[PDB]
PDB file of C-alpha atoms and ligand atoms in Angstrom:
ATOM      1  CA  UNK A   1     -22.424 -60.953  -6.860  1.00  0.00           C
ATOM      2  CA  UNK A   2     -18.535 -60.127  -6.558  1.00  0.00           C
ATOM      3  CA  UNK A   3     -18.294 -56.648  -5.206  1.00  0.00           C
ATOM      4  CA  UNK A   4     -15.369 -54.492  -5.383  1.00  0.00           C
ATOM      5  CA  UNK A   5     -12.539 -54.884  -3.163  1.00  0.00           C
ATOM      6  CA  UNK A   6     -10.532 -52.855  -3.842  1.00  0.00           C
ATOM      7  CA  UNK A   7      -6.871 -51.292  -2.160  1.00  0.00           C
ATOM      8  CA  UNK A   8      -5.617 -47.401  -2.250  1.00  0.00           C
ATOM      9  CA  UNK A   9      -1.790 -46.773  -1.862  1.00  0.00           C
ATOM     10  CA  UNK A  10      -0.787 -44.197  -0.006  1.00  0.00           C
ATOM     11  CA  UNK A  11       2.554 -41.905   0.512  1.00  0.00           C
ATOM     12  CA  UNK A  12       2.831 -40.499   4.171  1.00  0.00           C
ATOM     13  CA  UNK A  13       4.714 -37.335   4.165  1.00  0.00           C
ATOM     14  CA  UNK A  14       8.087 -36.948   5.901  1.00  0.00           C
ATOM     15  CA  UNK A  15      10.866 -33.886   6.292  1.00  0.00           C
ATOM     16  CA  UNK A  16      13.798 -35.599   4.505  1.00  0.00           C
ATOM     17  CA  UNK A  17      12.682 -37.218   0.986  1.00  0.00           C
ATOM     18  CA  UNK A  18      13.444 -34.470  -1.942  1.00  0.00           C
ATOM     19  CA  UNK A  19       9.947 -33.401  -3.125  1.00  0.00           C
ATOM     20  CA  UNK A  20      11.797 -34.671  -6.706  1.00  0.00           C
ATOM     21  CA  UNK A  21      12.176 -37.895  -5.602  1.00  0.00           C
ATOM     22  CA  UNK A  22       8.093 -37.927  -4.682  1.00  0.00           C
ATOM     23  CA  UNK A  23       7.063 -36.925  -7.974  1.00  0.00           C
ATOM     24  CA  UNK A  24       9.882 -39.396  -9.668  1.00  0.00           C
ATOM     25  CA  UNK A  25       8.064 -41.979  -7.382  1.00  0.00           C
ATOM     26  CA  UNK A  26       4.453 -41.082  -8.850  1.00  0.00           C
ATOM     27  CA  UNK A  27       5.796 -40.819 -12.656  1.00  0.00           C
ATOM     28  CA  UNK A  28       7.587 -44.154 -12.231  1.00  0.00           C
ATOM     29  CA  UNK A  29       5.409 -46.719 -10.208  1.00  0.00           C
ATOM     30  CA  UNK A  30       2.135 -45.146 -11.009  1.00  0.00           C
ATOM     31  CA  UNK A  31       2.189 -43.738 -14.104  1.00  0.00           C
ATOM     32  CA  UNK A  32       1.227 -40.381 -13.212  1.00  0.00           C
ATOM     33  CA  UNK A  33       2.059 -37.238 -15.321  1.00  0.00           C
ATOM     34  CA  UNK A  34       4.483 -34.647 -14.313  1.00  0.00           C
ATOM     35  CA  UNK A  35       1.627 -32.258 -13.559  1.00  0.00           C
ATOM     36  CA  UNK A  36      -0.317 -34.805 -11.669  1.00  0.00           C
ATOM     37  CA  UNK A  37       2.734 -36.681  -9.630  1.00  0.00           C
ATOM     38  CA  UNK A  38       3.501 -33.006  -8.810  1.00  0.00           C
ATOM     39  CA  UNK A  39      -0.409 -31.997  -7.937  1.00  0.00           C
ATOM     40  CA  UNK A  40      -0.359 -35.394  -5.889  1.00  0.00           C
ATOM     41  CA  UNK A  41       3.016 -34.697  -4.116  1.00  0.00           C
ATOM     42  CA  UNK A  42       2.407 -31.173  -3.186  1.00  0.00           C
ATOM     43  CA  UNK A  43      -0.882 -32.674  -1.435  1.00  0.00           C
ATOM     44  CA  UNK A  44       1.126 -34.821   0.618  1.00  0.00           C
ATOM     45  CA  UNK A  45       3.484 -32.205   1.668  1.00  0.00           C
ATOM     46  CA  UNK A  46       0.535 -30.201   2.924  1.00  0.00           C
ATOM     47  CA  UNK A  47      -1.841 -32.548   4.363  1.00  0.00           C
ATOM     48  CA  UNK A  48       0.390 -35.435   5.634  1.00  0.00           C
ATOM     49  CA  UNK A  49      -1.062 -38.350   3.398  1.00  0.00           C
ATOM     50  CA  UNK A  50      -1.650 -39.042  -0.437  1.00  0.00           C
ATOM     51  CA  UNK A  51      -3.728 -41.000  -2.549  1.00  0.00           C
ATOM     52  CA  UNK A  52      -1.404 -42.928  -5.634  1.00  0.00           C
ATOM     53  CA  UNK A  53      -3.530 -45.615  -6.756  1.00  0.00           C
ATOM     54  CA  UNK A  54      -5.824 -47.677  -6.308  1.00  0.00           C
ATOM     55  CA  UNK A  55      -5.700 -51.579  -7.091  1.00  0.00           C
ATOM     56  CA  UNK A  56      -6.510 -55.005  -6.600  1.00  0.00           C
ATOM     57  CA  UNK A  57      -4.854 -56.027  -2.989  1.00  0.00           C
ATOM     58  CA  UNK A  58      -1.847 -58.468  -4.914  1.00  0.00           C
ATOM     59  CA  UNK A  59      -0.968 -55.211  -7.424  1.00  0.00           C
ATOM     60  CA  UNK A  60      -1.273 -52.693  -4.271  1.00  0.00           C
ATOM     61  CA  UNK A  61       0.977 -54.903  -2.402  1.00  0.00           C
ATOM     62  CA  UNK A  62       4.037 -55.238  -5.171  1.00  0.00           C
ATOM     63  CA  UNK A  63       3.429 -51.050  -5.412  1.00  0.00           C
ATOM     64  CA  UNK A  64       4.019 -50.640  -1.509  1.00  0.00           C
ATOM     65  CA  UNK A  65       6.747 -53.004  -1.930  1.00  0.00           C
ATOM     66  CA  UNK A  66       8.227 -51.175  -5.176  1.00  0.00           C
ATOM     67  CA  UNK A  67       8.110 -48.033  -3.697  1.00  0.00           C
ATOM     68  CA  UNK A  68       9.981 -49.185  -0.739  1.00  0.00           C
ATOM     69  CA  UNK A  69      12.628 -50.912  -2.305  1.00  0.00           C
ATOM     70  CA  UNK A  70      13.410 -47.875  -4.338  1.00  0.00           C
ATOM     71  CA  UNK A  71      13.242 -45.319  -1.601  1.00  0.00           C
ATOM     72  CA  UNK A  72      15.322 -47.377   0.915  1.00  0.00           C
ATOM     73  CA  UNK A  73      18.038 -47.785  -2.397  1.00  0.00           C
ATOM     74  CA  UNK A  74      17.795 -43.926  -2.894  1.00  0.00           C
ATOM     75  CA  UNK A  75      18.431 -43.269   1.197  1.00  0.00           C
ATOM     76  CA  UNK A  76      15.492 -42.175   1.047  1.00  0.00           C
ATOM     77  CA  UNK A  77      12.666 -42.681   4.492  1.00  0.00           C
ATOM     78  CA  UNK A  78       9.671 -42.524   2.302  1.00  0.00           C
ATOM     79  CA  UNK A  79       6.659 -44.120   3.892  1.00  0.00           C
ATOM     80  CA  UNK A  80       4.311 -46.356   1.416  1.00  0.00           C
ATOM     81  CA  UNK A  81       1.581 -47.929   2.800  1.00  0.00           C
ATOM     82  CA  UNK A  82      -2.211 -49.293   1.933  1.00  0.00           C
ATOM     83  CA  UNK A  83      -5.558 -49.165   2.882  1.00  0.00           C
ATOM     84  CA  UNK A  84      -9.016 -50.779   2.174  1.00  0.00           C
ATOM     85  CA  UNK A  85     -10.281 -48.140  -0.722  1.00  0.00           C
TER      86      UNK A  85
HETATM   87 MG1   MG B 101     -14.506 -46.530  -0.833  1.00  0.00          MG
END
């Protein structure tokens, strides 16, 4: 049998990427409602570390990469990274 392997994206929180840019991250690249991107991004800002998705290791890559690509175009630090789910 084929288990799951599965890979979580996360956002790491930093002290200079607008809180609206977060939650315009989380609406945008992974589909979250308002109320959730702003649940998810309100975690992060307290905690350190947030939970977007959660995908096959290809689709978790592009995210990461998505994410990136947008934030560095936005002057924006934003940290993206992934992890074994
Ligand atoms: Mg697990």
């Amino acid at each position: 049998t084929q288990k799951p392997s599965l890979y979580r994206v996360l956002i790491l929180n930093d002290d200079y990427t607008p809180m609206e840019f977060v939650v315009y991250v989380l609406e945008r690249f992974f589909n979250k409602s308002r109320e959730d991107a702003t649940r998810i991004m309100l975690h992060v800002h307290q905690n350190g570390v947030g939970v977007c998705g959660v995908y096959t290791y290809e689709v978790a890559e592009t995210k990461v990469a998505q994410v990136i690509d947008s934030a560095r175009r936005h002057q924006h630090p934003l940290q993206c990274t992934m992890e074994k789910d």
